[PDB]
Amino acid sequence: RGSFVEMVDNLRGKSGQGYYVEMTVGSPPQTLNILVDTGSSNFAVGAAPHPFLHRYYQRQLSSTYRDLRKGVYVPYTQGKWEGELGTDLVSIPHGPNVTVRANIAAITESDKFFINGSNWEGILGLAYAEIARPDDSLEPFFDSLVKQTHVPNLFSLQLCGAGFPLNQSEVLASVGGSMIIGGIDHSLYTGSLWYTPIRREWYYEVIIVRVEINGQDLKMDCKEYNYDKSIVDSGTTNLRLPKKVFEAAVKSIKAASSTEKFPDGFWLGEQLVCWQAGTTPWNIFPVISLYLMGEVTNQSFRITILPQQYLRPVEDVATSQDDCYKFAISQSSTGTVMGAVIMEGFYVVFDRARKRIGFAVSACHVHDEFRTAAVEGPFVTLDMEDCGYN
Ligand SMILES: NC1=N[C@]23CC[C@H](NC(=O)c4cccc(Cl)c4)C[C@]2(COC3)CS1
């Protein structure tokens, strides 16, 4: 049974632009669409006009606005946002029937943060205080929610990729998945949930202990897979891999798919590839299995993803009925990132109460008649703590 009907189907969006949930801030409530981001820890919202914002938080119109008189500045490689800290009353309409007082970073300045046509106006950083800006004293939203209400200390995400391009109108009309706040809805997955420990509460950090490409062991020292960390991050599009792991994986994926040659720009994640309508040769691309540390000593399990996850549907550069995709695995210098395209294969349970992440096959994962995504175990795996980087 699915016991959280109120929250089922409360997300919209897609891997390329982000998945978002409706929220309200202030009194009277101001509605905003908010990116669900398990890879950061600030609740931050557009609070001033911007060419790509249809709306923003107007603090002067909220009677419950409190000014913390403190700035916050978040630079990343792509750009930056700067804002002003305060608190206000916050609700999630398609969420628990509660209102909480939470920290809000009112974004007043930004560079390449807001995206034309994303339909979101802010970000909900769902990770832990250690990585909150400006410092760990700024309580994240979910911590406030748990402290102030009886909502259990757990949330779960089903991100639903369509398997094909969605135009502006279609993405607004389409269900993009579910964020279940405070529980696990059994309608959103098939088979069993398998849990991996949260290694440390900052990012949602996990430990990968083995990688296979079509059953073939990538055969790297498992420390390489988690160098310098491995995280689950709904606010990143791609599966990102440490440089050396990326190089090994791409070599192996190229070898498995070698009946067709793709240009270097494709493997660099820059250039799309297209096939005649309906003829995408899924079967020539390999499955990718990531083995994760289990909860039991010396036990692991695996999650298996299809090319229908790691090839991201995109519309053609020019007018055609071709089916086109970008390669959604890319290189990282900050560790492995299990981004939205991986998360689309699975129902992911962020069990903060029990310091563990659950994976099950998603009821909305894209597949074909011959292969499905999988979550399978157990496997006997020795010395898994050695796979963690220090
Ligand atoms: N986890 C992350 N959080 C941040 C906030 C979210 C931001 N992501 C996006 O704009 C975005 C765009 C398209 C698709 C998707 Cl899925 C996400 C990237 C960063 C920037 O700052 C924190 C870094 S990485």
DSSP structure string for 157-183:
EEE---SS---HHHHHHS--EEEEETS
**From the CA of 20, how far away is ligand 1's center (Å)?**
12
**From the CA of 82, how far away is ligand 1's center (Å)?**
15
Query: What is the atom index within ligand 1 of the atom nearest the CA of 234?
Result: 16
Asked whether 210 and 307 are in contact (CB, 8 A), the reply is no
- Residue having the nearest C-alpha atom to atom 19 of ligand 1: 235
Is residue 1 situated within a structural domain? Answer: no
Could you identify the residue written with the tokens 């964020």? 179
Q: Which amino acid is at 56?
A: Y
Is residue 286 situated within a structural domain? Answer: yes
Q: Which residues contact 214 (CB under 8 A, 6 or more apart)?
A: 256, 286, 287
Beta strands at 239-242 and 329-332: parallel, antiparallel or unpaired: parallel
Is 94 found in the same domain as 182? no
Is 284 found in the same domain as 144? no
Is 381 found in the same domain as 354? yes
Q: How was this structure determined?
A: X-ray
Q: Where does 280-379 have alpha helices with state H?
A: 307-310, 340-343
Q: How far apart are CA 162 and CA 221, in angstroms?
A: 35
Q: Which amino acid is at 390?
A: N
Domain final position from 118, 151, 184: 151
Is 319 found in the same domain as 214? yes
Residue 51 three-state SS: coil
Domain final position from 109, 131, 151: 151
Is 167 found in the same domain as 143? no
Query: What is the atom index within ligand 1 of the atom nearest the CA of 39?
Result: 1
Query: Could you give the count of Cα atoms lying within 13 Å of 361 in the half-sphere of its Cβ?
Result: 16
Residue 284 three-state SS: helix
CA angle (376 as vertex; 223, 352 as ends), nearest 5 = 65
Is residue 7 situated within a structural domain? Answer: no
Domains identified in the chain, total number: 2
Asked whether 59 and 26 are in contact (CB, 8 A), the reply is yes
Is 176 found in the same domain as 137? no
Query: What is the atom index within ligand 1 of the atom nearest the CA of 78?
Result: 20
Residue 223 exposed, middle or buried by CB count within 10 Å (0-12, 13-18, 19+): middle
Domain harbouring 299, CATH code: 2.40.70.10
How many of the other CB atoms lie within 10 Å of CB of 153?
Answer: 15
Is residue 5 situated within a structural domain? Answer: no
Is residue 180 situated within a structural domain? Answer: yes
How many of the other CB atoms lie within 10 Å of CB of 83?
Answer: 24
Is 238 found in the same domain as 133? no
- Residue 44 structural domain: 19-151
Domain final position from 151, 176, 203: 151
Omega before 263 cis (within 30°)?
Answer: no
Is 278 found in the same domain as 174? yes
Is residue 43 situated within a structural domain? Answer: yes
Q: How far apart are CA 218 and CA 235, in angstroms?
A: 27
Ligand 1 proximal residues by C-beta, below 6 Å: 16-18, 35, 37, 39-40, 74, 76, 115, 123, 233, 235-237, 340
Is 131 found in the same domain as 206? no
Full strand arrangement of the beta sheet holding 336-338: 205-206, 230-232, 336-338, 239-242, 329-332
Give the CA-trace dihedral at 197, 21, 44, 127, to 10 degrees: 0
Is 305 found in the same domain as 191? yes
Q: Which residues contact 221 (CB under 8 A, 6 or more apart)?
A: none
**From the CA of 39, how far away is ligand 1's center (Å)?**
8
Full strand arrangement of the beta sheet holding 323-327: 273-275, 323-327, 311-314
Q: How far is CA 355 from CA 196, 228, 293, 339, in A?
A: 9, 20, 13, 20
Residue 40 three-state SS: coil
Full strand arrangement of the beta sheet holding 216-217: 216-217, 208-213, 288-293, 299-305, 374-380
Could you identify the residue written with the tokens 């949602």? 204
Is residue 77 situated within a structural domain? Answer: yes
Is residue 13 situated within a structural domain? Answer: no
Catalytic residue among 143, 185, 233, 351: 233
**From the CA of 321, how far away is ligand 1's center (Å)?**
30
Structure tokens at 15: 């891997």
Q: Which amino acid is at 161?
A: G
Is 340 found in the same domain as 321? yes
Residue 49 three-state SS: coil
- Residue having the nearest C-alpha atom to atom 6 of ligand 1: 235
Our answer to whether residue 386 is catalytic in this structure is no
Asked whether 194 and 230 are in contact (CB, 8 A), the reply is no
Query: What is the atom index within ligand 1 of the atom nearest the CA of 19?
Result: 16
Is 158 found in the same domain as 258? yes
Our answer to whether residue 233 is catalytic in this structure is yes
**From the CA of 236, how far away is ligand 1's center (Å)?**
5
